[PDB]
Design a protein around this ligand. Structure first.
Ligand SMILES: NC(=O)CC[C@H](N)C(=O)O
Ligand SMILES: [Cl-]
Ligand SMILES: [Cl-]
Lengths: 231, 226
């Protein structure tokens, strides 16, 4: 969608050129002292964290049109020690040094507001996930994850709502852990979801909405174009 | 925060007056169609949510100084249906309509950046909590909440690090058992009615990404007890 399309144009007129990235590649890593503003234009990515013994923790997933910042704009100090890994086959992104971003948004307030809103989206998304987790536990978390998958990559055809994520990206969010299985197993049993033609389908959406009401509220409030397509 | 001190001054020169709030009092509620920007200057608050069946869910806690926004800056639409309840005895806050903020920040960039950071702060805090929960489960969650309590309201005295939260706020707080284990290992202790910290390392062990966040987000305060 568009506010982001205007930003892409803005960055290009200001000399920031797009860069191509592939699967498993890192846009930025934990140890990089250079702080950035990553305008992920197209693709899917994950924000990871490496514990001191080396175990990799998946923290957040971002889709292609979004901003990710490893530095604070005011102080230009690290927001945290993270890695921004690419998950999709290919991804396009504009890598900007945190200090240029300061200037680009200073010059242009429409874009300052766009990036500012994205943070507001991030904050509220987290609170929505958390609310649903607090009420329904792991069930709320899963339905929530399935609901975002549904709205963002779903389209209606005879056999329910098809998740159009290349199953290779869904192996990074498994078809296949086992209380998840207790849940995912139950959802298959109830005909809420179905695994038939190497794709996951959704046959009971009202159910997902029921057990992920705050996330459902978030989509409607944060990005209403996407929410309206299935409502 | 000096940055927040400058913001207080800015809002007052711009005619926004401070308002006093007491315990259980709501700055804003979920049914208010007016979106706001709450510059919580002094006090402690909680961001709650009421489920359709009436059950109250505590989602996040905020300390005086910080900004909380119920609306998106440009579109001016609800960010979510929440309540901002006061939990401390008394709280001071500048309640500003969202549209007012839009015009206010548009005329001073230093302050636009300050509020923008606050969001960045929030985002990374959530990811830190989550990382620690993902590794250590609720043990990571509790050590994390105890670590926050320690750094923000802790002071060194002979019997460990004293949590200087009026016990009344400490009641705002299956297994009381983690906490039992912590009390057994002399990580924390509950005489004299206060909560002490004897093994700050244990908390940092199981909530390590939260510790990292406090080091980067509040460095001066972090270096006080380290
Ligand atoms: N000074 C503060 O209250 C910081 C708040 C912190 N970012 C939080 O999410 O709780
Ligand atoms: Cl996510
Ligand atoms: Cl919190």
């Amino acid at each position: 969608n568009a506010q982001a399309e205007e930003f892409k144009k803005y960055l290009e007129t200001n000399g920031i050129k797009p860069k191509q990235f592939h699967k498993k590649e890192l846009i930025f890593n934990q140890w990089d002292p250079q702080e950035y503003c990553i305008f992920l234009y197209d693709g899917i990515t994950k924000l990871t964290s490496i514990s001191e013994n080396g175990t990799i923790m998946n923290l957040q997933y971002y889709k292609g049109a979004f901003v990710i910042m490893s530095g604070f704009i005011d102080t230009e100090t690290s927001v945290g020690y993270y890695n921004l890994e690419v998950i999709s086959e290919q991804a396009t992104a504009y890598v900007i040094k945190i200090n240029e971003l300061k200037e680009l948004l200073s010059k242009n307030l429409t874009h300052f507001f766009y990036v500012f809103q994205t943070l507001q989206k991030q904050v509220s998304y987290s609170l929505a996930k958390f609310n649903d987790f607090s009420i329904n536990g792991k069930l709320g978390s899963i339905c929530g994850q399935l609901l975002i998958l549904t709205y963002v990559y779903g389209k209606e055809t005879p056999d329910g709502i098809k998740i159009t994520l290349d199953n290779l990206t869904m192996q990074e969010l498994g078809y296949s852990s086992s209380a998840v299985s207790r849940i995912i197993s139950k959802l298959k049993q109830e005909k809420v979801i179905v695994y038939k033609n190497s794709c996951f389908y959704v046959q009971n959406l009202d159910y997902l909405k029921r057990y992920a009401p705050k996330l459902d509220e978030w989509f409607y409030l944060a990005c209403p174009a996407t929410w309206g397509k299935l409502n």
